[model samples]
Target chain A: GPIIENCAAFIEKTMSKYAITLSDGTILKSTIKNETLKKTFPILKNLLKDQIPTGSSFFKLPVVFFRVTDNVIVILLTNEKENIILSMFELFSTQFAEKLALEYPRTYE
Target chain B: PIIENCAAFIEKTMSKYAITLSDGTILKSTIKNETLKKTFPILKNLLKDQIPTGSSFFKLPVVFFRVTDNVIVILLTNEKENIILSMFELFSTQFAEKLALEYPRTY
Candidate 1:
């Protein structure tokens, strides 16, 4: 609907939680202070131990992560427009992962 | 939506529709016994003749039918569903037309 930055703003407003953190070895304060994201991240990350394969996309219904570093952690949100949101997540996941593996890593980076 | 020999179709099947004929032959499929009374014929008249109704809601699952003088309609469903109601309206119009068709056969 809105442009890229505007879409991000809408997502940020509607989403209860979200974040972009750094690798475990690196130190980068999260770009956004998200409470819900922080709470759910443990459960989300736990699903991926060695299965994520570093640069590959991590997707588990309604949630998609474009890039995950022991540093660049990309997590997505879904609250409505299920078909639209799910499709957007897949599109963003693939493109964002491309950007990360090639140049820009992580969704919204 | 056309029910051949629909006169007995509703009462025989006991579905969810109620139709009153031109001569006031009430064919009911609903469990509500109100349609069986003398007053119900006027209610059907109010919808068929008095009202310019285009299918408004009574509660949730109710769809009041409106059509030619030969037919009076009251079709109900399980619950308030958009698609179901939409299809009901389309079905109602067409089905009522089937009843109306008999009105001109003598001509």
Candidate 2:
């Protein structure tokens, strides 16, 4: 919980919303409300039917699907301009993934 | 001739983006995997089609989507390095615009 809390704070810098999901699209942690997250998760999952390589991320305008590990994805809803999201996605994703891997080795493995 | 010159300049500028990590490891902005190459066209399309309004929304600077087992690492840079990042962002934006103009109906 602490790790997720810290990650949420870090993400707050550029993102208005963040969600942590399993590779199978299970929602583990999120800032979005339960109803919205419940509604949104399925759509996100559907879009991600195509497998993404580990550590690879893609920006679909307002949202970024960041695969932090083989089993975890940290989705970010941009609070700033889309261009800003691009910069921050590159700037922060690597470190964020490192932190997640360190905290959850089994998830990464 | 103008398009050729612009493309050359763009290629040269693109090669200059080098990310220096905290431990002094430098990651050059190069596509080391074929996955990235295949995905780029999709990324380009997403960028072009996603923006509903405004010029600044979709224009992206160096998109560093690393396709590896490890996370894509980047860090804070010095003031000088920040300028380099800014320059790349500017050029990349204009380059995308030019391409969009060239192929208004296609891209």
Candidate 3:
């Protein structure tokens, strides 16, 4: 029950969401998964592959990257928990490009 | 001036520094004559044809968006006055996207 209580508290206190626009003009809504929710959160990387518990918990703790435009919002939820969540959000726009620029300063210039 | 009035200033700086805004909005002083030039780059060279006859350089009020590790920053500004450039950088990531999605016509 301790993990459950911690998960509830974290969800209530830490989970966050934000919207961003892509270079192609796509608008999206994204959520940040709390570290503790690893048990329920989706594992998107091979590191967590074959390690997630399925069924009810899987449905409850899925992590998602969602796209929200004028009329519809599509959610891409995964069961993998090892993916770098924040970087994924940046993949759509200036933020990601900026990071790429920083990582490879010469190529961008 | 006020925060609103400083948008043009911020935009100018962003262009000078070659910084890209999160929304893909570019800032450029050279094409400042064309208010929509930065947003629509195809109109860059067509400035002569696009410039309205009696139009002059008027400050365009705008709201800017910034994204960081765990926050989104907003700076609102207008011409001649920095009315209110509020920075909401300390927000829960979960809630920020919801609010942004709900308000589509934002800067």
Candidate 4:
């Protein structure tokens, strides 16, 4: 749970880098995350509801999954968007796996 | 709660900004609502943390507030960082006075 909360906090803090909202309600931005997952989830599924396609490879990337247990939700970022998501996922997963392995090496094995 | 339901709110809000942490979890939030309270404290701290001798006191806009109700929070953006807590410090006294006068008494 601490890991999840810390990861969320780090992500939230990092958001200040590439984007900012003006006082007038206009958002000057880019969808780096969306683009990374674009190939997986496709523009159709990721885009507005009316713009989705019935069937297409557009759903190949940009998909994110959250695995929730009793008290923790593990958010895994897949490998399609600039390797950022996958890299982060790997880092956290390793740390988590290591911790779990220490407590339950047989289970990890 | 669930992803599908949370996605509905995310979709309705049109919030597109997301941050990818070092460990890869992404946090999606609107910039308007992100850390408004935290920034206020940081701003105040920055001003008071330093004051050069004989230099004109730091005159910078700082936002503050007190929650009157669950929905309504009264805000005051002071112009003088040095005199932020002073009662008579007059940076934008005219504007503040006007705002105080115009603010709805019932809200």
lDDT of each: 0.46, 0.49, 0.29, 0.29
Ranking of all candidate structures by their TM-score, best first:
2, 1, 3, 4
TM-score of 2: 0.41
lDDT of 3 by residue, B1-107 (tens): 11222234445433321212233344322234344335434223223244421122222443323322111222223434322222222222323333222222221
The alpha-carbon lDDT assigned to residue B39 of candidate 2 equals 39
Model 3 has a DockQ score of 0.01
lDDT of 3 by residue, A14-107 (tens): 2443222221212332343322222222232221233322111112234453322222222234444524443343333222333322332221
lDDT of 2 by residue, B1-107 (tens): 32453335445545423222122233333444443445345444544454221222212333432111111222122224455456545544444332222222210
For residues A1-109, write the lDDT of model 2, one tens digit per residue.
Answer: 4877766777777677888866644456888764444444434554456667776677664567776676667787664676666566566665677766666554311
- Give per-residue CA lDDT, model 1, range A2-78, as digits (tens): 22343345446555444444332111223344333344354444544454656555555555554443335556654
Interface C-alpha RMSD after superposing true interface residues, each candidate, one decimal? 34.6, 16.0, 13.1, 19.8
Position A16, candidate 3: lDDT? 42
Clashing pairs in 1: A17-A37, A22-A71, A23-A70, A23-A71, A24-A70, A100-A104, A100-A105
* Consecutive 10-residue window with the lowest summed lDDT within model 3 chain A: A51-60
- Show where candidate 1 strays beyond 4 Å: A1-109, B5-14, B28-35, B38-45, B53-62, B81-84, B104-107
Mark the 10 consecutive residues where model 4 chain A has the least summed lDDT: A19-28
Q: TM-score for all predictions?
A: 0.33, 0.41, 0.21, 0.20
Q: Where is model 2 more than 4 Å wrong at Cα?
A: A105-109, B1-107
Model 4, global lDDT: 0.29
Model 2: which residue pairs collide?
A94-B72
